[PDB]
Design a protein around this nucleic acid. Structure first.
Ligand SMILES: [Mg+2]
Ligand SMILES: [Mg+2]
Lengths: 146, 131, 784, 293, 242
RNA sequence: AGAAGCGGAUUUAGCUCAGUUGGGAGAGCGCCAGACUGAAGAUCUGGAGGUCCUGUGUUCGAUCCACAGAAUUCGCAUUU
RNA sequence: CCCGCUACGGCGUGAGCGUCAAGGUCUGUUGAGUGCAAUCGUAGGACGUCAUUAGUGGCGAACCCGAUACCGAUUACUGCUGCUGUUCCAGC
């Protein structure tokens, strides 16, 4: 006997809103300009407290009651700004739509959230994340060598 | 070779005790909409507030509410969830959902508004069958 | 948010990849699993928790420490003697088969008494004690004898005294218990051959024994069921006059070549049963055949066991001059397949003499390739009993690391005919195979000899020309099935067979796995992929029809697919007919040939054919279909065993020019064998219908073959597929399995030659069982 | 027929005395449950595990079905059952269970810790298992334990009235109920209304929609109120009045007298049921051949 | 491969000159679109029906894909299409389609009127119908006016970029989109991103979840986003070339 | 809420646990009462308190023995 | 162990072979093969059962769910089939 809970990978991307500053047009350069850094006051509990407030103000209470049954952040590190949220397979739609409507953190505004990978296991999501980061290193190395 | 469910009717009956309140207070039509938006705002959010519902054949604490099929229970779980408080009535009220049907056939009184609603529905069903 | 440098970014992301990999490895290490689960899934032992000896010796110490961390009966006066009778019989049988002498026939039959068996085994020891003559004294310690029947069929073998009534109805393989511990067997014929391995080996045998390049292994099939006969001309000591005639009578002029006389290669082909009573010759398609010759005159012929009984009956009918030799329990071959099968086979055997065939086979064993070698590769030599080694070891010389085709042509120029054919003459004669058992030892004896070498002197037992059993050994290539078969006497096979898969890259084959191997190499198979022949049609149709009918009446109503009410099957749905073409089960060649003769009668009646509206006037399709349904309803009451209905065309097209009274089915219809590959999405299944491309819709299927799809970017077939008529059927796919070596679907079909010369293009559509979609494909001719 | 088997009594300790306002409030909410429609009501009473229990016989029952609810019954036309939810937290202090069980009709439990949950399913003869839906769940239930407990008897109970109390409690309620439905395999689910007021009452078709939105199907919900609800009533009703489901003091008439349906016709003093001479061995044969009844 | 076809051009009238900040903002938001992952880009421009159309041939389009975006087309690895949404309310100062369809590629309309919906379904051979999801519903959607127009070939478009503007606008957005879903019979629904800033762009996984919870199934949504989008692209392309 | 598969141990009063030629159903703690103290604790005495996990069958008789159906719980180089 | 340099055991290559050791690895994994444990969502058509006010609506389940594979036995539920036992009702 086991439980069939799905995990969702998300990444915090900062859009470079600079109206007076010029821009360079390339692939890995705009990957550098979007994958810059996470700010100082970002942790597991801060992202959980923000997403529960977004779940309250956006989806309500009983929808928040269905979502908050197994709403946990299993793995997150601020150095790469990628996180894995555990959820049910039925309310995965609700969790992804809550991840979409994330507007701003209470400390830092001007950011979007990208839900990338959903699977019922975390080990294949880690294997996909290593391969996706390997492809990012490939693009960076191709633009760095030439 | 099938029929798409357009929406579903819901038969509500506000059971109100404390007979002084039932004799004094009289719920008007705007209070129905305000209380249903408050009920869909307390337990649900914006997407639960944007549930399509209109008012049909409103009587004295008696309501027929049409709600789309794909969010049927999404309506009828919230109606049995929220309790009225602090909205122009001193006492809270109870809600009894009497019957549910998806085939237009309910018999309340021999009133003539139901035949008019059936004709309005058939004027759309003929356009759905032809076009 | 703040912009960072390039080197800091790639360093942080590389450190994150390393941290995620270390975290995944740490989670895999912190997951509480035993070292019992550390073994691969092929080698996992369930009883290894009970006793530690299943576990590898490096891991057994950890198994012992974690097992320590985790932690003469009541018998009556009659059944005691009933149990002691078996123990005394086993002891006396062991002493009798071990000391000097052979087996009496009364113990073999085992249908009279057991006390007479005890008295006979007591009497033989006393007769050996009191006198030297009047003893059928053997030549070895292990109970090996000569089960060779001259001019008659071989009877039920003697075997072992304990496992005798278990051989009462069906006989056994020499590796019966060994294969029984490791495989699923089915009882179909008089033997009990393997059907499928216990562990799942579909993709495993497909990749290791298949035609795929990544085939780092070896696959072994116990093919002792394939029966052989040896024929020799007794009339003349000179050149064989009647041999070429009897080969031209048994087979066609297809396997009677002068090239096969000169180069003496084995050929596998199609044999048909002849029958000449008085001035008339009736030929029926019989089945497969393997023919091999020794330089001019003596011949071994090996094939399917029921076909073996029929060929032996026909050969015993005309047995006037030549002497026949039945070999069912004195000679058998096993089949190796793969890339490293030759290396494991050369690992299993060693040399006893410096000869040329050893050098040829040792150079063949190193190239790790099959088809680059020529058509003839038939090597034979004298070797040692493989019980001397009892260990997985390979022997390879230096050879300066060079492999070219020049050395292969050099071995093709020089072929040692004399010694190889002398080994053939040793294996054909019953005296030399009996002389081969003159020094057969027990496992106790070879263990004692190994202990003597360990005391005096390496892991070997040396060869002695006086007291060691030099065996004949023959390894030949089989061409179309792409596999190496090695033949040997019956009681010699198991000392060779046990040492084979102790090489750690060698697995065993089941009969379903052999069918998969024949399916992968675009080849054919007799019980399944031969519907044209008599026995194949009878067995396939009867067993699959009865099995599918039992399964169909077995399932409840409303859970299985309902064959009776299927709408939109063909355009212009014909009256009194709502189901699928023929019966829904196994291939109705009778329906196909009656419909083909009906369309032929319509073409002979008029230039065009009408669609719809004692035998009624045939003018369209449904009058033929009602006659089909009436003949099926009549043959459901009485079974048909009169004649065949569909022969092949590939023997008829070349010479007979495929030429074809109120007749509807008297003259049968001939077919060619095709292999069609799916170009459209989907996979075929068993008993699949094969239809023509429509001539009005040919350009649409040509555009679908080139390309047409929705503007999204991915392939589209959700379109209005035009339905052709009912009579556009041309064939039946018997074997349908998703072909993994191509990435598409393969279907082995059989189509009419007149219909094949109708279309100018090879584009032919397929339809599955109970599925109303049509899938285009292209066929290639199977010349088997 | 509908069963509402978790209506609480406004008392927690035996030292406290219930005022008349709470009694009149319970009368009004029973009139509310009679107004729209229900069939059976089993009122609940909370008992902690470490309290000082009285050694009495006729004072273990502060319910009084006879004097006040017997007067409410004639204008109502329903029946009331009494029950104890054992609030068992630690294996330190206990009770005499043979008196508390035979006092009322239904015996329930309320675990807080690990070992109590095991010894309740293992040894303690109860009828229903209730968890604290208002607070955090004690442990997360194993499938083979809850399945074996349902196969032994006792079913799990869901209190949909506890979500109507507060705002924050709804999330913990749904997080508990989805775990109960997951680990219970949808066999032992009995639902009840924990309302303390007539202002929190619901109808059948709204409770069915609540069970739909929680995760359990609709036909299985109505089957849980028809089959599963009234059988676990009969379990405790036969266990505490009669022997351990062996020999019953309940009269088997045609369609009016039953152990469940006829409570007032059974003398609830000790066991007995006074029934007139309806069985005569003299001149009564087959039922279809009689002429006097 | 994905198609995003609703990115607005920061200009409303031809008299207003586009500043240097708006061009950089459009470059930033289209690079944000390529960052999350999209293949096709069809940027939109708003034209009022009360506005007087210019009598020019090579000056109808103030977009200039060739001189500005022709470098980003080569560097980034994408392409740009031009399209016009027509804010049509009353039948006056108009009825010209033979000239605006040749210059631009996709022709869309924005009816807010009751008779405007009828004149859009009757005498406008356009590609997409757009409703104002920001403001209120015009009168009422019925099956009779929608089913006669979807069967002709015109698709109904939902703007998921207008939802990330305000808090109060989200309720009217859901009330409009669910009405479009129940009136559309889940067939002709093409969705697009109406973002004016790079802070309001999302990826396929969140938008699919949004349209799934708003009432369109997962088959019809993804099948639409691929097939119907890339079909109306070649509809505009064959109205241009042929 | 960290499965799956393997071995060992085990269920007896409210609790923690004994115990058994197979013939009595228990100890400590807890509860109540007695004794004692100005009062209370400790000590001491007595009473109340049983589904021996459930079922079959063996026997003259089952906590024990045999079988069947549940499970409790540890270990898998661990403190999640 | 063979080749070249050097000559007291030495050094450099062969993507060479044999033995020994190592908690370095085992997706070396199986017409499903996971290991914080995937086995999905939707639309249309065919068939079965049940209820209808005009003809359509609901349902295809219950038990349960791999972790090396095989087979026997036991237990939980639905439907079909044969036998047996009981009760009720008549043909004379
Ligand atoms: Mg299991
Ligand atoms: Mg198991």
């Amino acid at each position: 006997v086991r439980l069939k809970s799905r995990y969702i990978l998300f990444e915090i991307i900062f859009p470079p809103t600079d109206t007076n500053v010029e821009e360079s047009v390339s692939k890995a350069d705009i990957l550098l300009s979007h994958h810059r850094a996470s700010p100082a006051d970002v942790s597991i509990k801060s992202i959980l407290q923000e997403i529960r407030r977004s779940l309250s103000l956006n989806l309500g209470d009983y929808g928040s009651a269905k979502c908050n049954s197994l709403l946990q952040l299993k793995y997150f590190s601020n150095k790469t700004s990628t996180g894995i949220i555990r959820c049910h397979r039925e309310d995965c739609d609700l969790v992804i739509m809550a991840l979409m409507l994330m507007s701003k953190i209470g400390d830092v505004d001007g950011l979007i959230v990208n839900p990338v990978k959903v699977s019922g296991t975390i080990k294949k999501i880690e294997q996909f994340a290593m391969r996706r980061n390997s492809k990012i290193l490939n693009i960076i190395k191709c633009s760095q060598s030439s | 070779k099938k029929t798409f469910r357009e929406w579903q009717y819901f038969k509500l009956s506000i059971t109100s005790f404390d007979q002084d309140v039932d004799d004094a207070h009289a719920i008007d039509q705007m209070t129905w909409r305000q209380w249903l938006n408050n009920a869909l705002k307390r337990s649900y959010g914006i997407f639960g507030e944007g549930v399509e519902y209109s008012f049909l054949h409103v009587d004295d604490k008696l309501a027929y509410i049409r709600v789309n099929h794909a969010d049927k229970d999404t309506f009828s779980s919230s109606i049995s969830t929220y309790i009225s408080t602090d909205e122009l009535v001193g006492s809270p009220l109870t809600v009894s959902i009497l019957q549910e049907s998806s085939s237009l056939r309910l018999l309340e009184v021999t009133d003539d508004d139901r035949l008019w609603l059936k004709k309005v529905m058939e004027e759309e069903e003929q356009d759905c069958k032809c076009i | 948010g703040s912009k960072l440098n390039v080197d800091q970014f790639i360093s942080s992301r590389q450190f994150e990849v390393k941290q995620l990999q270390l975290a995944m490895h740490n989670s895999k290490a912190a997951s509480s699993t035993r070292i019992f689960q550390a073994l691969p899934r092929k080698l996992r032992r369930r009883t290894a928790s009970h006793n530690v000896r299943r576990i590898p010796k490096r891991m057994r110490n950890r198994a012992l420490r974690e097992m320590r961390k985790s932690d003469a009966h009541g018998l009556n006066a009659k059944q005691l003697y009933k149990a002691r009778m078996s123990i005394k019989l086993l002891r006396l049988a062991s002493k009798s088969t071990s000391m000097k002498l052979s087996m009496p026939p009364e113990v073999t039959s085992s249908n009279c008494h057991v006390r007479q068996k005890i008295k006979t085994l007591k009497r033989m020891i006393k007769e050996s004690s009191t006198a030297n003559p009047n003893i059928k004294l053997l030549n070895n310690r292990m109970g090996s004898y000569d089960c060779t029947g001259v001019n008659e069929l071989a009877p039920i073998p003697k075997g072992r005294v304990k496992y005798t009534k278990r051989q009462k109805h069906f006989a056994w393989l020499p590796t019966h218990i060994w294969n029984a511990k490791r495989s699923h067997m089915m009882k179909r014929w008089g033997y009990q051959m393997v059907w499928a391995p216990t562990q799942k080996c579909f993709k495993l045998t497909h990749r290791l024994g298949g035609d795929t390049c990544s085939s780092d292994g070896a696959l072994c099939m116990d093919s002792s069921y394939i029966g052989t006969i040896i024929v020799k001309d007794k009339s003349n000591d000179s050149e064989g006059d009647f041999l070429k005639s009897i080969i031209g009578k048994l087979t066609a002029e297809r396997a009677n070549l002068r090239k096969y006389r000169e180069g003496q290669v084995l050929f596998q082909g199609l044999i048909y049963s002849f029958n000449e009573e008085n001035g008339e010759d009736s030929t029926k398609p019989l089945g497969p055949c393997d023919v091999f010759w020794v330089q001019k005159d003596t011949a071994i012929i090996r094939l399917h066991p029921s076909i073996y009984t029929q060929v032996f009956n026909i050969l015993l009918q005309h047995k006037e001059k030549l002497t026949v030799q039945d070999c069912r329990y004195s000679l058998a071959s096993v089949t190796l397949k793969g890339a490293k099968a030759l290396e494991s086979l050369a690992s299993c055997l060693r040399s006893t003499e410096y000869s040329k065939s050893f050098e040829q086979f040792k150079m063949v064993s190193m190239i790790t390739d099959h088809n680059a070698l020529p058509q003839r590769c038939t090597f034979a030599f004298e070797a040692i009993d493989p019980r001397h080694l009892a260990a997985p070891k390979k022997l390879n010389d230096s050879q300066r690391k060079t492999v070219n085709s020049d050395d292969i042509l050099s071995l093709h120029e020089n072929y040692p005919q004399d010694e190889i054919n002398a080994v053939f003459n040793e294996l054909c004669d019953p005296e030399s195979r009996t002389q081969s058992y003159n020094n057969q030892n027990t496992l106790k004896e070879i263990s004692a000899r190994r202990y003597k070498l360990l005391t005096a002197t390496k892991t070997t037992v040396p060869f002695k020309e006086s007291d060691d059993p030099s065996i004949p050994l023959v390894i030949i290539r089989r061409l179309k099935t792409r596999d190496w078969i090695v033949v040997l006497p019956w009681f010699w096979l198991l000392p060779l067979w046990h040492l084979l898969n102790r090489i750690p890259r060698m697995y065993h084959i089941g009969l379903r796995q052999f069918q998969q191997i024949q399916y992968e190499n675009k080849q054919l198979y007799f019980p399944d992929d031969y519907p044209f022949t008599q026995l194949g049609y009878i067995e396939n149709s009867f067993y699959k029809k009865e099995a599918s009918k039992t399964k169909w009446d077995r399932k409840p109503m409303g859970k299985r697919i309902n064959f009776e009410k299927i709408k939109d099957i063909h355009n212009t749905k014909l009256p009194a007919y709502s189901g699928e073409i023929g019966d829904f089960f196994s291939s109705d060649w009778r329906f196909l040939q009656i419909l083909r003769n009906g369309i032929d009668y319509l073409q002979r009646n008029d230039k065009t054919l009408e669609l719809m509206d004692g035998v009624r006037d045939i003018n369209c399709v449904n009058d033929v279909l009602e006659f089909c349904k009436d003949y099926e309803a009549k043959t459901k009451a009485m079974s048909l065993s009169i004649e065949e209905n569909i022969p092949v065309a590939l023997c008829k097209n070349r010479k007979c020019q495929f030429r074809t009274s109120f007749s509807l089915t008297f003259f049968p219809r001939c077919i060619i064998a095709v292999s069609c590959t799916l170009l459209e999405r989907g996979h075929p299944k068993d008993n699949a219908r094969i239809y023509q491309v429509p001539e009005k819709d040919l350009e649409h299927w040509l555009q679908l073959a080139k390309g047409v799809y929705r503007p999204n970017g991915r392939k589209d077939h959700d379109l209005k597929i035009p339905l052709p008529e009912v009579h556009d059927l041309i064939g039946f796919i018997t074997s349908g399995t998703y072909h993994l070596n191509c990435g598409n679907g393969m279907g082995i079909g059989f189509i009419d030659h007149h219909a094949a010369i109708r279309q100018p293009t090879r584009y032919v559509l397929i339809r599955n069982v109970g599925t109303n979609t049509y899938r285009l494909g292209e066929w290639s001719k199977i010349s088997v | 027929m509908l069963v509402d088997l978790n209506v609480p009594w406004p008392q927690n300790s035996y030292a406290d005395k219930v005022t008349s306002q709470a009694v009149n409030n319970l009368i009004k909410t029973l009139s509310t449950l009679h107004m729209l429609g229900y069939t059976h009501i089993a009122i609940n009473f909370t008992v902690n595990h470490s309290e000082k229990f009285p050694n009495d016989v006729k004072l273990l029952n502060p319910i009084d079905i006879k004097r006040r609810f017997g007067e409410l019954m004639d204008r109502t036309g329903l029946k009331l059952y009494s029950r104890i939810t054992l609030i068992i937290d630690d294996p330190s202090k206990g009770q005499s269970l043979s008196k508390i069980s035979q006092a009322f009709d239904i015996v329930a439990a309320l675990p807080i810790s690990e070992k109590g949950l095991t010894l309740s399913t293992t040894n303690l003869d109860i009828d229903l298992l209730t968890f604290q839906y208002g607070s955090r769940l004690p442990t997360f239930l194993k499938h083979k334990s809850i399945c074996s407990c349902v196969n032994r008897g006792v079913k799990l109970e869901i209190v949909y009235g506890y979500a109507l109390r507060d705002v924050q409690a709804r999330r913990q309620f749904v997080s508990n109920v989805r775990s109960v439905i997951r680990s219970s395999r949808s066999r032992g689910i009995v639902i009840g209304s924990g309302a303390m007021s007539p202002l929190e009452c619901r109808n059948i078709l709204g409770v069915t929609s609540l069970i739909k939105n929680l995760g359990l199907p609709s036909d299985r919900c109505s089957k849980a109120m028809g089959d599963l609800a009234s059988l676990v009533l009969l379990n405790g009703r036969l266990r505490n009045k009669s022997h351990k489901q062996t020999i019953v003091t309940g009269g088997g008439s045609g369609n009016g007298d039953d152990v469940v349906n006829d409570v007032q016709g059974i003398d609830d003093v000790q066991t007995i049921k006074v029934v007139k001479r309806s069985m005569d061995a003299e001149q009564l044969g087959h039922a279809s051949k009689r002429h006097k009844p």
